[model samples]
Target: SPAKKKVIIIGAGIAGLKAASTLHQNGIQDCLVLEARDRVGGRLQTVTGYQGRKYDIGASWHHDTLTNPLFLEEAQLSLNDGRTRFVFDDDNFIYIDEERGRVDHDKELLLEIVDNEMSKFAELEFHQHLGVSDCSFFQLVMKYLLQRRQFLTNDQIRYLPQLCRYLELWHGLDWKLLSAKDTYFGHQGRNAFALNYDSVVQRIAQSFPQNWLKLSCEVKSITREPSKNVTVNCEDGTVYNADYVIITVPQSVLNLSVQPEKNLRGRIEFQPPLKPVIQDAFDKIHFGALGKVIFEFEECCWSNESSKIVTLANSTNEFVEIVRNAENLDELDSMLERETSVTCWSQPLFFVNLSKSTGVASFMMLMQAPLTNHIESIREDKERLFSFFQPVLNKIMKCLDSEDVIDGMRANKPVLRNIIVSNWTRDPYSRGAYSACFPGDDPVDMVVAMSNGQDSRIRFAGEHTIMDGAGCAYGAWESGRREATRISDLLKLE
Candidate 1:
């Protein structure tokens, strides 16, 4: 309660850690980096599996390797140390269906060719037309199928729709829920899968002063005093006055502050409350759950043709009937208004055979929204989880020239040694995977508002704060530097 600091950064993630590091390097002492969890790395955690094997459960890749400043920095460190940091493990995606096996590079179906066409069609639909209203990704796909039915064969119509849902895994939203306009994005460069993301986190954490970091401090309320000092109160009644505060909590956790519930673990009650601009931006964007399930096997026993494998949700022939008979978009849209339950075969999943890439006997499977929540809820029950994913697991094994997966959580032909499920949805601090957009969601609004800050003293920095690397680790890192540099410059002037 007696201490007063130049800056207090809440949430010691990459963003907050980097902010503290920048402040220290810039000669701005009397800074504090507080984290709720008793760890430095927030989401970029590396957990140990069987026999001391490491896997990044959070963001495993340094996305957009070309322009990612963070990756470049890491590369420089590796160059100096002569140690391996990351692997450029981008491989061709193998698309698998329930009934039919590998439908990715089919000579007859030519799905990849049509998939490219669909992408172009989407670009033309929105990128070309300014006044066009936004729709779901599914609706956009339907429109493409309806307009190009003459050229597409029956099989193409059936499987291509399923194949395109790979984007669902990307945005962590179902096709119906995902925003068509925000769906397609350009990856600036290849993704470098970090050998150990925690290493990167530690490297940044070490760059800053150790005493400035205070873990296990759950900040509760922040009030901007009339004296131009911001008073922050932690759950344990520790108070500190600072000239500025940078909130680097995840977007989902920050959303809790807007709600009426005061008892929520992550909810921070702002004295004047957040501005209308910040609150309204929440309406335009939402959180996405891109959950991961690491099926660690005893040993590798499958074909490592490609590290990426997409198991398409089971498709039906009846879907083709509606596509063929519908005359117009409106009529066709209603014709496909079918309610259904979520199965393993409902929304497709993205599976990465880690054995192929990193020589780890594991299949790191990624799931989106509805499934992410459901699976995360049942994460503790390894048997139930294994049983749920058994069908796809078996299908993947068979396709990869292996047999069905044998149940052995503590036991991979393809025997399951261990099954590790991500609890991002269930995590109180991290409510979801990252910032995502639904149909008609304008993420730009939130980015602008977050970048602008609640006031000059109350700043926000996270994956959702920037335009360039929105929802990526690098963007969060960049945003931290943005605010720290601004505050550092002002303090230096004084």
Candidate 2:
């Protein structure tokens, strides 16, 4: 009799779980799923923070509703007017300034125009026209600013970082490296609200056989003998053999160095190094650095004029100067430590005001690199955390604080009940928030190279492997289905 068919699927994430379900549907049930985490859902992590409140520490929103199958499936279960299928309110947005108080309607319109142009400009073939190999989004931004120099002041350069900060918040990477050609991916449609991502994870997991999943298994190395079987070695010294393996870990994990001296986290050693095409793509691709700070308030005190308020600031010079002058380790540490102090003294890029409902109230601070990097320092030092964020919190309160509520807020200075900050950057498993396109690099080619596994024995499936849907939860699911179909067809040949 033929040996039992064995398939090993690493990572019980959205992609891994979907792959297992697809295999089951195709009558291939001899698959084993291994997850490094104790639970399922790789990045779709939800946790109960202070006061037993549920918060999505990882992915929060379901993006691109029209093309997102997950959202379409979710919609079938809900009974709504259907008008709320996708909601993006530009008028419902409020702009806050640290010096000028709230931005006037005229200034707001101008800022909106700048925002719209940046999106449009990112898609233009300016590099091709200029006969350059490629350039960063920062270059385009500078050109745009110079063109609009008549409207902007020397002081306004500080506010220009707002553009960089906005792009960073969405893409989760440094704008300087972001590709001018590959700036945008997929359709810009309605984004639906997702209170709990675990729900989606749970539904996907139910389709796969529970007994086939092994949690808390950290894979150390993967030895593939394409002609024979693929072997996976875990840190615990346990080995698993399979006819085929599907890797769904983040792209950051691919470039990790297993050497202890390197101090790289999520480091995995490969017996036979990945193909040059795949390795080169991994080296070229860039991971994003993004984090969130959620402030939970016991009571809502802000004006309800807008559902969300964005704080735009002119404090980039202070941050840039701090990093520029630092030459030594101690000086760099001191520079980062002073970040919290700067936020207090200058205006912030933006802060979103999330309205409270069902007796819960909260606001989120989305920041990019250098600014968000300070979160680690603040987290390590509680005093620093409060000292750094206290003034910024009060600044928002001063803007949105209602006259009737001002006396109460002033009387109870400690209105903020608790604050929860995301540690995505610190997470060894994730290494970063998400992925994005880089200058002179082909994001699609990189994804194609990753998806094209070695002799179909080692398959790849992740959000990074999806082109149109890259950087979205739905993209991960779609990639999972794609790999599953490919693997299932290959198996049918035998």
Candidate 3:
């Protein structure tokens, strides 16, 4: 193969950008980056709404601040310039139930205390036992309730499960679909919400040669010749040969290569297809959709006592009766089979009141799994979307000492100026939000296979390819640096 570039990087998200940046810092030249989207930032997009207010519909937090290298770097730069890159927005959560109203910090419920015990119970169950099998988060909660029924009050049994569902938003899966083993995780530290994630994306994009980057060039196929050079073909008829190629596409998009379709938007056909290890890992792990809807209002008229609020899905007294009457877990599970059509109160919804955190009269609401895909399907019909979420919006307004929201996408008594929804589920480049787990899923398998690469020359780097940041932007950033640093070290020997 006639090699033109020394190294080629795919997908200009933070991972690919950081890879090229590290190569440039190590004095490696003749490097190129290919991106399918017109914009450099893949998932880290900041869109503008009414009155020019901006919102990061993607990742807005600097997670694991104590050890996240990318976050630390941003912090250092902020220290040097005395400019704020992020704002620490940790506050006591305000929890609301449809029937019970504000159930947080209740005198008798003690939901948070029981929630802590449940985490401990899970740890004790799986920590040292080799024979114990994994179960769904829902089943685990049921087992805890069955075992501790005598100690827990009827109200505690009713509300604890709903409150614990807050973890659902964290993983983008319903409790019944989530892995109990993966449910409990320790946060490194408080999250610092980034004022502008685009700022971080731009800072890294400019670190390398501007000419080395190519946007709107969807890579169609990649082949590794016997000459040890990797050849990349783009949809636009551009081809390039490089000694090494690093892939940084989202796991969901990359999984398309495993399918039979050739016309799929982001499918990258590999000459000697991806390794068996890489292909098999997809069986154990999957993607999760964490969708968001941004509601921009005319002014700050609602209460801003706390920035974070969660509206628990509607629960029933019959559910509590089932929990109390059942003799065993299986019997109790059989008794809890009631169902209904999905609504705003069908599942818990998290709302971050931007008026308190960032001084913007807006609300960033998070949705998970089935709801995520369904809402994104109808994202275009603003009226339909508003109606779907209207009940909860009005409830919040009433609780915050304001009138019902007036219909102004076509609301003051609290007027609604605009509504913006994230289309990650609908976007071809990003099939879903990020990597997540189901019961019995071993996410480490995918991480190991991806980090090792497809026979060395073709490498993988992204949030899905690493463990520390797993599905965070910083994880993707660190993974990019990992691959580029390795290649740079080897190239110097030549």
Candidate 4:
């Protein structure tokens, strides 16, 4: 037999595993998969939370199903009909500004404002000034709000931060630096993608042998040989070689990991230096930091409708003037102006509070903070973050007790809930929650990362690697299968 066409895959994430599985299906068991993590499923980790419940820490829900591939597998396995995609509407939405309170229950109005602002982002161009790039998502947002000059009241202006919160949480970065174009990488690529939210995905994933899908094994280095065979040297010094390799490591890993000197050797050192397209793609991809600071509370603390707490610069009159007109302002000098802190408070609570201990339900608060390479900034601000939300947490607890909104919510007398935060930014495995699109980068970099071509020995696949399909589980799977087919076809040609 023609030296069992070898295949070595790095990172047992969805893409790596699927590529191996696909090769196996094609009777190419000669393939070997070397994962940096002890287990497979890259960002698709099904973690067991407070209760034995397996919640996905990284790639959670398959929001858009038009082009997801996991959904089809679910249906085929008789797993789920894909019906109950939850939608809480205004209640489910993050309250734009806690000081402004709950926004009017008007979907059309919210959508109109959001639509107008987001449309401006589409006009951005990036190819020319590769280094300078575009502005961060936050800068763009601030610019749009300033241009519109529409917020008449301080309350109206409060909701504006909600937009940044939403996007930042998704990409795990501050809006000021991440590119708006890359942030909104939409459903255009997932033409037939399907999602498997109904637990069946676990069964499908678990069917493989434990040895084949080792959990906790993180790769240390990947070395390419003169024969074009790549030897993946893992963190533990375990090495595995292959005729072809499909690397499905997260983009975050690329930006964070220390590169092995040998791998960066001469022209032949690149032996198969990352192709120009791959280089460009890597250059364009951006990663953000988002970590959790979860504090399990003594009791449920909030009382209003599910509130969205916010931090604003509007604590001063000068900041308010940047986006508002004096004529349309609220009773400014007229009424007793109670100084509002940068923090906004939410009144009511969600059932998630039920996760709290006996006297307390849980209140998970997300704060807007940035992560820089500087260690001092992270260490200095780590403890103070808890304090940042303390003021808003106290105010929200008071509102929960108010007569408005859900009166019974306060009657329950939930305790002053301590907080729990997810410091995903700090986690090495996950440099950030979602991927960031920095200035100058666009969907094209993502496309190159995910593209399947024969000239390349190593193929890349991941949510962040895939363009529109980036960020979700289904997209990851689709990218995996796409590469697998390409590899198989190449094998046939050989």
Candidate 5:
């Protein structure tokens, strides 16, 4: 095994670590991993917020448990899995609102509306028609449902848009910037997809690439030699030469314009230019931005309710107030040990269309989703936008106001518990959330972004690089393995 090749990896994200693991499994132990952050997992980082409860700072929940690799591989064995519980249906329910107090209801009628709308909305399929590129889901729905003068009451008209906006949060992007096709695909395969990803992180940790993993190292540059033996310069000012190299850093880092900076410093350079297609793919790929908001209450607000929690599918301040009422419940002291599950939406704008959120309220961090191309609309007017959702907020307050259940409810303004507005769009390391393609272009654009690299010399892998499986942890893992296999086979040929 004198030819046991040495591979230098840049970034400790899922793709980089997975590549290292795959290479080691293939008996190529001579590898080094470089990371800008102190730890591994890249975008998949977890941190504790407000109430000493841990929140996933980066990649939190998987879509569908069955197919979600991180969920399937990591969550089960970790404390996250043993302790994590989910609520999918109505049994006993408590409604809490900071403005109006709490309500315990055995039979709630609104759940049926949510289920019906979600089912119908999820079934409708969409692709870029003829020439249309950017339009909101609201606009798409307009074609079928007209609320302008009919169907919805005046109050419903006022509140419905916010409801739509709240639901859109699942996509993690603004409705206008999102293509209808994107949401359709997300909802379609979400169940199976999230199921698998739930375990990817743990699986990755278990499959550590042994000797192939280089910790606390940073790759400064990569140069393709005349013989195709690539030279990688590390931040420690060391150089490692190899027959092939895989650049698995997130496109966010790549788009950061590291090449020019490194080249000027004489740290990295390529003699043989990359293929035009690969270069174009890199340039065309996009990474999105996201934010997270969490809230913690001091007391149990809805103790006597039949169900421990009630979820409001909202993306606004009023909805947050309702969740905050959990402190006033009569059973609050009894459920002291357990944390509650409320709503998790795709975007903040969706709150404008929800039935529950009414008026201004305090909140934790704002949950964010990444959008492609049009980054301007992701976050435009915060205060004005919240004010816009006031009508819907009023409606939600009325619902909670009508119920007399919990006691000593004081109107408290929501606080900014924790805020993380990591601009993947602005960050050079990532350009968009995941990859999305235009009409007529092969969805394969993403696959090529992930696959096409400097021969076996410079390989590529990441969530964005995956086409069919793009935007998920498992796909990133699969891409890493694919490149490492290619590199291993190329080394054997020598």
Candidate 6:
């Protein structure tokens, strides 16, 4: 046992914690976990909200319950026993506009058109040709539109692009760079519920030795020597040596420039540097910048059946124009939540009602890039952030033109209580939300390169490395167990 290898796991996220847990189960008890943030949960962040409701600041839902390990392991016990409740979102949604009031949009019809085009595009083998050309999904979809123009009307033309942009929000990548062929992946048969992830993460963290975790210990550099012993340097000049190290940081952190700066993306450097192929994989794949803004209110004004509120911009340029001007932000309370502007890239703004699910009278606003970037720019200025979003909130309430609503807002009325936003893109630990590969390269191959590392002694595991479950919590958990299994097998040989 004295000659038994000692291991170090970096980043106390699900991946890191799971790795340590697996190691302990395999009899490798000599393990250390270093987490950048004071908390153990990486992206499974939760915060207390109004009326003791727990709101997830990081990850909320377990996608595809049947297959997702998190759900498979915990859902039955949690949901069946009445510990958690979740609802599957359907097309019965409410559409909002700036000019017109709430309107009914044919969600099913639009989705069919989008699906038909994508299927046709794939069946024709345009994706095979696309592997070499690297064209955007938008470009190809536009061509499809022209060909099918006879079947569609002007309204469909105006709205289809926004619908496409809305779907792309999941990837958080610009449509121009999104690969038409590679983007199509089978959805998990059914959607998972927004179960309690805080409990799940805590359970994992508690499974390991409490003393093993070192919070606020940001890893600086990883130096691997020929002897296979790796030295991990921390931001505070603390040094740790281990026979092996498992890195489970986000892909965005791995892709950070080695050159030092106050805001170094990952802020950690590899001694010999990652292999070129590994580095290339990082460059080829992109981390998405997606965020949620939670707005809490005194009462639920929207319908209980309507889970989603979608706002479409008239055009891409108008959307940009609205975001660019501060006056527009101020006017949102009085402005129509209706769709006034339209374009091919009109980024749709989403509002999800959390009352029926979490018992919290709040709505989560899902935003894309540039918009998120803009919010970040004005984050420090609370006055500006509040002033800008207040009007938008009023618009969502459909009382923008209501004198009483405007008067209530000005006098600190009970219409809206609190607003909170996430900055995952700017977080030093997680540079972006999740990983998605753009056009021009094999995504699976890139993910494999990351897992293989240059040598077996130095291993990598994260959501990015997961092939089957990439961009999901279960994937990250699975990756950690896999690396631990690999190391356990290798130790037998040693």
TM-score, one value per model: 0.98, 0.83, 0.98, 0.70, 0.64, 0.84
Candidate 2's residue-wise lDDT over 105-145, tens digit each?
A: 44443655556666665556453366656667665665555
User: Which sections of candidate 6 miss by over 4 Å?
Assistant: 1-5, 79-82, 85-91, 100-132, 257-265, 316-346, 390-395, 399-414, 439-442
- 12, model 6: CA deviation in Å? 0.8
Question: In model 2, which regions exceed 4 Å deviation?
Answer: 1-5, 79-91, 107-109, 125-130, 150-164, 182-187, 257-265, 315-350, 356-359, 402-414
Across 1-494, the per-residue lDDT of candidate 4 in tens digits comes to 12333776666667666666677677665655665454555566544333333333444444555455665555444445545332222233433234544343445336336544555444443333354446666555555555555643453344544433455555655566667656554433322212223243445355444445545556655556666666665555566666676767666665433344544211112344555565556566666654443334433435545433333222234545645643322333333133322332322221222232122244433333453222214434534545554554444455455321121211544433233234355555655655656766666655664575324666667666675456666666777777777778877786
Clashing residue pairs in all predictions, respectively, total 4, 3, 6, 57, 79, 16
The pairs that clash in candidate 1 are 298-412, 408-411, 411-417, 412-415
Candidate maximizing lDDT = 3
Supply the TM-score for candidate 6: 0.84
lDDT of 4 at 276: 59
lDDT of 3 by residue, 1-494 (tens): 44499999999999999999999999999999999999998999999989999999999999988998999999999899999899999888889888677888878888989989988998888886777878999999999999999999998899999999999999888888899888888899999999999999999999999998999999999998977889999898878988999999999998998989789999999989998999999998989889999999989899999999999998888889999999998898788875468999989999999999999999999999999999999998999988998899988888788988887865347988799999999999999999999999999999999999997789999999999999999999999999999999999989
RMSD of each predicted structure: 1.3, 6.1, 1.2, 7.7, 12.2, 7.1
CA shift of 105, model 5, Å:
12
Q: After the best TM-score superposition of candidate 6, give how far the Cα of residue 114 lies from its true spot, in angstroms.
A: 5.2
Range of the 10 consecutive residues with the lowest summed lDDT in candidate 3: 404-413
Off by over 4 Å in 1: 338-341, 410-412
Q: Lowest-lDDT window of 10 residues in candidate 1?
A: 408-417
Off by over 4 Å in 3: 1-3
Return whichever of 1 and 2 wins on lDDT.
1
Q: Which one wins by TM-score: 4 or 6? A: 6
